[PDB]
Ligand binder design. Sequence first.
Ligand SMILES: Nc1ncnc2c1ncn2[C@@H]1O[C@H](COP(=O)(O)OP(=O)(O)NP(=O)(O)O)[C@@H](O)[C@H]1O
Ligand SMILES: [Mg+2]
Length: 281
Amino acid sequence: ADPEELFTKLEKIGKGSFGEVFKGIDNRTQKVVAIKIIDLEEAEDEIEDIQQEITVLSQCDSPYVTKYYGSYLKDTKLWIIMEYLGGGSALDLLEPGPLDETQIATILREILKGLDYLHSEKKIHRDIKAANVLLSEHGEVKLADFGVAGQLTDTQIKRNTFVGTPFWMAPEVIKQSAYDSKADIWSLGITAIELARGEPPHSELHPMKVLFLIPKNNPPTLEGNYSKPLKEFVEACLNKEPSFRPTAKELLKHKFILRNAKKTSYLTELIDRYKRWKAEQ
Ligand SMILES: Nc1ncnc2c1ncn2[C@@H]1O[C@H](COP(=O)(O)OP(=O)(O)NP(=O)(O)O)[C@@H](O)[C@H]1O
Ligand SMILES: [Mg+2]
């Protein structure tokens, strides 16, 4: 199985902490794919995380989670084949300017369907933030970046690992207590603020400072010119006690969602705005 023979790299579309991501195509069947290529010698440090990402990805089967088309090994390089999402991340789409509440609600609804799927599979994402929410060019919204996702089982009904991105981390995760899927609900509340304001609470502070602030301080609220149901949606998520947070399933029925969420195809307006912006940068 030679991925240099099976796939054609068309353009580089991303560079993360390790490896490189390419826009590619299956030379058989001509489906366009995202290809994450990692040098396993250069990232021997991360092989455990890479293994987990691939494992979780292979076990997911949902229109709200980035599809996985397998991994290929060429010499020391691992080729991870995924669904290609060329619309940009929700964070990318914030670059040109603010979202309206119709866009915020539509994006949050789709993130919620993704979380409801994961949580029904007893999986916890643990790194929900707008950068890890990816859109297709025609506005479909999917969860990405499963490198630190956790699996609950019948025996392991809670997780304890300190993991995530600090601005978005739930207080119970930070204070490595036993936690479950409600940790993602906190992160969603922070992401809702991020979608509304362009950045999470404490964004200007040092990450290590935030790590003691999040357990100590009052939970964040959304202030300013936002509808009260949006402010209430945020408040519902950002409860320091995880058992008082609603499930993703309940949140799908929240008034801010029901009132403001529209068809995902309307998000092409946002995707075009990003393309216009990018062309004049
Ligand atoms: N399936 C995909 N389709 C399109 N773009 C993607 C896809 N997966 C990842 N990307 C983008 O490619 C880049 C590299 O992604 P990745 O290697 O997963 O690092 P990252 O987690 O986004 N950043 P980091 O947390 O600093 O390592 C990012 O800008 C992603 O948004
Ligand atoms: Mg990441």
